[PDB]
Structure to design on (2028 residues):
């Protein structure tokens, strides 16, 4: 009778509704099991949440088990209910609520549970401590599964204690008050802190006491919105690996490391009020793949300059494939550091808080070997006028020992007459750049072809030069006498480099013929002229005139008023010329300020091969013909070499602003101090 | 009593069968809960599959919940059944069937669900879109957990929408029609497409609109079998990280990237009908660890040549530790690109679709700094005769600015008389290789020892040379007069390099003695000879004669007919010789085709130290004794230097085929244009 | 009535206890379902274990299903019970017990199951084989989730079979008998072995037969405590990726690889009885980010020397950003290898089993290009006296072709008079270091300023030198005649390098003035002295005397007895002197043993600019004034050059111990063999 009816009721689709369950862990503690391994259903952890439920099985004898409020629940009678859960725990098992609830204690219980933790959601916490080799954390993304520090909390969102080794932190977020872009911070906060070990263990990897061997992996973790540090690895910790770490929106320092013996791969740090990265006392570590951008972010309101990267008091660092870009101040400051090795390095368009003021790498009492350097300044290339670095390298001391190789000057056209290196400050440090011999340090014997002085009167006249030219007198340049220096050498297909110190006297309308190849200007003149043209109103034009290959082309540009050459000021004026590749540069030797243009590819109507068929001779301060325009002012330190890129020209200027470009290519070098 | 039978019936081992369950989600929609939080068992998602079942709990008030056919199931009365599932969703929860079923909608439901997706199986789909910061996908392997595009589908298997950021794609496969090797493709398909963002958001990382910050990780993903692209990252996307990406069997382009600001580590692309990798307008990115093989794969039937890697219109790239190998055409084509930095670069055995035709790196209007280059051509080393690159480097324009350092010629024996660089095309570009000064660009003063002419008659005779020798006449070489050039210099333990242009007159049987150290040939001769021996049938043998260290050795080889020297053709003939290290090279200066062999280690019976005991003098075109064999033809541009590796010899040939090898090692250089 | 009491009983909180269950998988085989898809609860896998339970669903039609003892259970009647389990399996489902139980068979069942395996715990095993593309393994940490080889087992803990491709091994430990530090091993054990493939399939990636394409990822795996190998990848396997692999405590070789075409990133190997890493016949591979430490670990009792890294019979390797440190013998031995490319390389403080005995890189019949080299020997820098490498580089043959660039000598102070290179053995190999021209190999013409001889008698006297000086006689140095060499050249702000061979006659108390800048010693003397001061007891002090910038400073040190200069022994004595930067070096040219000190930064009271104001001339063997102290012994091979770092000085000594430092900086070089 009732039997058949009971069975049919239980057999309907909703039949599970008739099996009772505990409505809270509090009920579970008041439910005594009557048999071993007894199964019980938990509807939820805390009454009225519908979260944290599951199935439990009983141990009648609970001695040796401890109530942990989520996976081991003990009854008054001493039994233990064990959550059926083979693998990872999650905070809801310990009473987490999600939303805006403070889930600190549930989360702390997970990482203390003896198993890895899965973040399935976002949880607010104040401060969490990772203590054990079981304290791993996994999410399923850099954003939606995350810990989020409460607005009222200070200190470290996560602290990795010195008892915690061999864990994985993978694919979750660690967010602070300022995680969303453009929002404010809570003072005194850090995303992840790895404390300094207080001792050394002898039973690794089974240690339960302090040990310096972190031997742990932070993998695809997103840290965002903290005040003092995103990630801060303190001294004494070994083998903290990071891999695809992403740090965003830090009020101060994105990442600080102060320890040895570690490797990071594919790190990105973006938008910090101070440095993106501080290496302070680091040694014997590796950074492989790095992007450090928008350091010294002005809206975060920090007073003072801070570089994209601080490398201080460090040694034996290999840093490969990193980029430092769009930072508000200097790119990289290397201070009091030994043996910094960098292989593939990109620094461009930093110093964005004040135009033409900061430098991409600043050396101070440091040694470094840097290869594969690049730094196309994309603001200079597009001509947008946005703030960017004054130049690539600055040396604050002369006791550095530094080697730099790469593309020191990129070689785009220069729409705004500027490039990567717009202020060049030479150094007396033990510097080698691009394998170029420093002319001041060589005893190498070279050819030195003698030019012939020409003018209406053929006696050279010498007049005073400013003392920054490093000589007493130079060659008097006048339009009336057509003072010039003629070489019989003709340009060949390998190209030529020509440079000189010129002190222009600038008055009215005038054509300055700084230097030329050949003479004349026509479809068959096979000639080059570098000219400064001044009109009656004082407007200045730098013009490159090319004739040959059956045509002519004028590559000219009007200088803005703030870039004009000034009368009586010494400039180093240089050109590189070869088929299909012409560049010019004008450098104020007193301020280091430079203007430049480079012409390749579509900027040239033709390559102008016929300029270089060994028919057109080289002349300084005019062309080779008696009727050519000349100059007004003084000339000094005339240099003829085989072709140098603008890359190498700029590189050699870090040795000295007016010396020969490349001793191994030097053809002629005439001081012109009362002799020719 | 009926109580006791019910209780006993449920208590049997199979008692669970008496608790009813829903047989489908359709039943679930027709089951109204009678209590809040009611538990219900779902047998399966779709009737008759036994897949996708689980436990659900009821919300009586389901307003604000939407039926999604998997984890939220709505009743007619408005209640909501919520699947008990804390973490990731999988397609079976939404009705996927696996096997040959089109599981597109179940999979799309997963990635739209608000949580990460776990692939537990292979699922056919047509097209999937990833839209949200929750749209992560995880598998458990590169093959068995995968999405598989249906043969009838076209377009992108996966599209990452510009609203989707901060996700992880980890450890699963994305397969197309051609995933299995040797199979055909479906026209118009792409594995993973990252679309161009249409806007910029101001509330990252909480954005719900278009944004360029992908900030996501593709990790241990296997893409195979698509037509147009495996992975295609379009313009405007930042921070798409790839890590251990594997791309296989792509009909056209393995990976295309067209954006800036990203890092990849350990990428492998294998077997593509066109490029393995296209970088098109990329900038400020990093590739760290890369293997690009079997590009331009002939069986995929693409018409035309395509390099392993195209780098076009790109800038500020750091590409470290990559290899390009076994590709059908050129290795890497760099076009219209600035500041490409490469540190540790391996290109070998490309050009496999046509022997001796393609080059490992092709530069066209580009600048690059390349360090740590290697390229052991394993086909040349094994003597297999398989198609391989003509040589390492080719310059399509002379406006490139390029530095290359490394092992340009590997230095294995040369069983088939070839090596890495078998056709050398010199360039007038702004090129620097291995830090070698280009002789045509230097004004450096060196020693230039004067040899003495010897012959039966001691008056030199001069005859014309082909115009490719770059002079009017050379030294007449005859066996009758035994014309030779004697140096008093003896070879020392650092070794020696000797080279000359020789225009051989080849007629009958004859011994040409190109150059020698010392004289005689015996156990105590302390001598070296490089000879071409021609027998009565016209067969040519290149013989290296070594005498000293108590023995003699002849290292000879018969030249195949297609490699024989031709009468009246100018060849640059060079040797480097030192204890334990001898190499020779013969270079056709009109075609650039080269033959060579190198001897170190086990190939030498002894080091032949005593050749270098400062006792044996250097001679060109004979040995030092009056009875020595001589030459027939004309000699020119005799070069003596200190020891250069074949690496540096070959590197210097890219400057010019006949000029001195190393200006810093130059001891003598005599043109022989009607003077000695 | 009774119906409501049944309902009330089933409805109590513990009501779940009334639904029966199978107490073991054996019972499940004896429980016949009476309905298709029937649900059953399994209490546990094995009776009395409380492990491996779950829910199963029945298929009455069991054809096509095979009993696997964990997830498919067959009844006597032919039904099949299928474990409800969408994703990964774990060993407890197959009867694992954990703890001290041998769980080999349960773990083997997992990896053969057709799905990936999750390790939730530590499991003892003997030997496991990975056979299928489903045989992935995931844990949740490098320690607590792991396989542990039983002490009684030998051989390979894990073998990856050549049928197994495209799997992931992620975040678990593989432990052997010696996993805990300081414990003993089981002979003949290996952690992970990748066997040599026996064939090639044509249906990759769907192959079920032998194939060389492993195409798999070992990620965050921790291998520890095995005898012969931690990880051993045998020949013929392609694309075994490792990423964040950690190997600890290996009795013999940490990692062996013997195959081609692979990439590793961020590998760490620590504490091995023999090598940390053996590359045996490897080619066309990449290692990017590596740490290899404590190789040849003395307590593991291996007899004989073994390097940190063995590279033998290998080719086309790109190895970037690795470090080898604290190894017992040599750092890296490169043998019989072509084209080894290394970019960013740190080797320091190896050879710790015997002080001053081993070298950081040992080359034997190999070619290599090494850039970004660093190696700050932290033991020499701290003055701890701990055993460390004799020096950076050693060449076992003269047929190597090697380029090295970086920080060859770091330039720290030298508290104990030593540095990175304390024994220098020059080589006749084809070697280039730091781009320095080898003086023995150059024909470059340089300046060679002639000094003037001074003495009480102005006729120089010549006496014999030891034959190791490479000349018959040198300049007789005496205190009575004050024999000296004066240069009129004055030191400038760029600095100066001075060096000479001095054969000191050491007797009583005496002041040797090896070389000087200027004369006198006072606040305005603007002078430098390098002195050896000997007192009446025989104590030797090396003193650098600096006067200028308004002050004086004496930088002196007492030599320990074992570092004293010996009478009649030739020493190469060198200084680099520049503002803020002074170093000196004393090199025994017969043993190669060197002592040295360097002064920068805080070690200097002032930069001493006024020494370099072009007022103080250079003198050898005394100062410029008639009253200066002189020397006792013989002088030879006097060298003046522009400033060289100690880095370049040391680098050039690998060419030859007594030759000029830098041909491009050479100002004077006087042999002094019976002439001035
Ligand atoms: K690298
Ligand atoms: Zn939430
Ligand atoms: Zn504070
Ligand atoms: Zn502590
Ligand atoms: Zn005139
Ligand atoms: Zn025209
Ligand atoms: Zn003109
Ligand atoms: Zn139904
Ligand atoms: Zn399937
Ligand atoms: Zn859009
Ligand atoms: Zn990685
Ligand atoms: Zn004769
Ligand atoms: Zn002979
Ligand atoms: Zn003879
Ligand atoms: Zn039983
Ligand atoms: Zn356990
Ligand atoms: Zn096999
Ligand atoms: Zn003195
Ligand atoms: Zn004083
Ligand atoms: Zn140098």
């Amino acid at each position: 009778d009732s039997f058949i009816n009971v069975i049919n009721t239980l057999g309907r689709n909703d039949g599970a509704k008739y099996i009772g369950e505990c409505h809270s862990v509090a009920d579970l503690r008041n439910t005594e099991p009557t048999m071993d391994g007894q199964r019980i259903i938990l509807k939820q952890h805390t009454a009225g949440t519908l979260l944290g439920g599951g199935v439990f099985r009983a141990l009648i004898d609970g001695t040796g088990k401890t109530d942990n409020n989520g996976t081991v629940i003990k009854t008054v009678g001493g039994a233990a209910w064990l959550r059926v859960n083979a693998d990872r725990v999650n905070p809801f098992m310990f009473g987490a609520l999600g939303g805006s609830n403070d889930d600190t204690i549930p989360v702390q219980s997970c990482v203390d549970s003896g198993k890895a933790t899965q973040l399935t959601d976002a949880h607010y916490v104040s401060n969490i401590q990772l203590k054990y080799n079981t304290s791993s954390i996994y999410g399923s993304g850099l954003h939606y599964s995350r810990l989020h520090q409460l607005p009222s909390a200070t200190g470290n969102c996560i602290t990795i204690k010195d008892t915690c080794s061999l864990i994985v932190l993978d694919a979750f977020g660690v967010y602070g008050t300022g995680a969303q872009q453009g929002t404010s911070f809570t003072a005194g906060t850090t995303g992840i802190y790895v404390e300094t070990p207080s001792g050394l263990s002898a039973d690794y990897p089974f240690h339960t006491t302090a040990d310096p061997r972190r031997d742990l992996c932070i993998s695809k973790v997103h840290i965002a919105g903290f005040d003092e540090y995103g990630l801060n690895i303190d001294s004494g910790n070994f083998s903290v690996t990071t891999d695809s770490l992403l740090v965003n929106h830090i009020n101060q320092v994105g990442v600080r490391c102060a320890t040895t013996d570690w490797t990071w791969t594919n790190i990105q740090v973006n938008t910090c009020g101070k440095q993106c990265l501080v290496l302070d006392g680091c040694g014997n570590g590796r950074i492989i793949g790095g992007k450090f951008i928008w350091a010294n972010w002005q809206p975060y309101g920090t007073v003072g300059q801070f570089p994209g990267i601080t490398i201080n008091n460090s040694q034996n660092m290999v840093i490969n494939g990193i980029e430092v870009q769009d930072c508000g101040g200097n790119g990289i400051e290397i201070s009091e550091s030994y043996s910094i090795s960098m292989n593939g390095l990109n620094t461009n368009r930093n110093g964005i808080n004040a135009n033409n003021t900061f430098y991409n790498i600043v050396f101070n009492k440091s040694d470094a070997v840097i290869n594969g350097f690049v730094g196309l300044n994309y603001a200079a290339n597009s001509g947008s006028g946005a703030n960017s670095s004054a130049g690539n390298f600055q040396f604050l001391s002369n006791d550095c020992s530094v080697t730099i190789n790469g593309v020191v000057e990129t070689g785009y056209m220069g729409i705004n007459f500027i490039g990567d290196n717009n202020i060049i400050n030479p150094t007396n440090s033990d510097l080698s750049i691009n394998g170029l011999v420093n002319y001041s340090k060589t005893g190498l014997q070279t050819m030195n072809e003698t030019p012939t002085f020409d003018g209406v009167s053929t006696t050279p006249v010498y007049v005073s030069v400013p003392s920054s030219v490093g000589q007493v007198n130079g060659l008097r340049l006048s339009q009336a006498n057509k003072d010039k220096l003629l070489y019989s050498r003709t340009a060949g297909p390998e190209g030529i480099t020509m440079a000189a110190v010129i002190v222009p006297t600038i008055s009215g309308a005038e054509v300055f013929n700084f230097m030329a190849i050949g003479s004349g200007f026509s479809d068959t003149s096979n000639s080059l002229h570098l000219q400064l043209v001044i009109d009656a109103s004082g407007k200045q034009t730098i013009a490159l005139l090319l004739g040959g290959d059956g045509t002519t082309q004028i590559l000219s540009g009007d200088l803005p008023n703030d870039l004009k050459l000034q009368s009586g000021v010494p400039y180093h004026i240089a050109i590189g010329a070869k088929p299909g590749y012409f560049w010019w540069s004008i450098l104020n030797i007193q301020t280091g300020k430079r203007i430049r243009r480079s012409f390749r590819g579509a900027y040239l109507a033709v390559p102008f091969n016929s300029i270089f068929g060994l028919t057109s001779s080289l002349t300084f301060f005019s062309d080779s013909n008696a009727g050519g325009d000349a100059c007004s002012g003084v000339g000094a330190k005339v240099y003829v070499g085989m072709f140098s890129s603008e890359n190498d020209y700029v590189a050699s200027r870090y040795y000295n602003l007016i010396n020969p470009v490349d001793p191994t290519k030097l053809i002629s070098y005439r001081i012109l101090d009362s002799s020719i």
Summary: Residues B 98-99, 121-122 surround zinc ion (ligand 9) (CB under 6 Å). Helices of chain B lie at 2-10, 25-29, 104-111, 378-382, 646-653. The two ends of chain B are 129 Å apart (CA to CA).
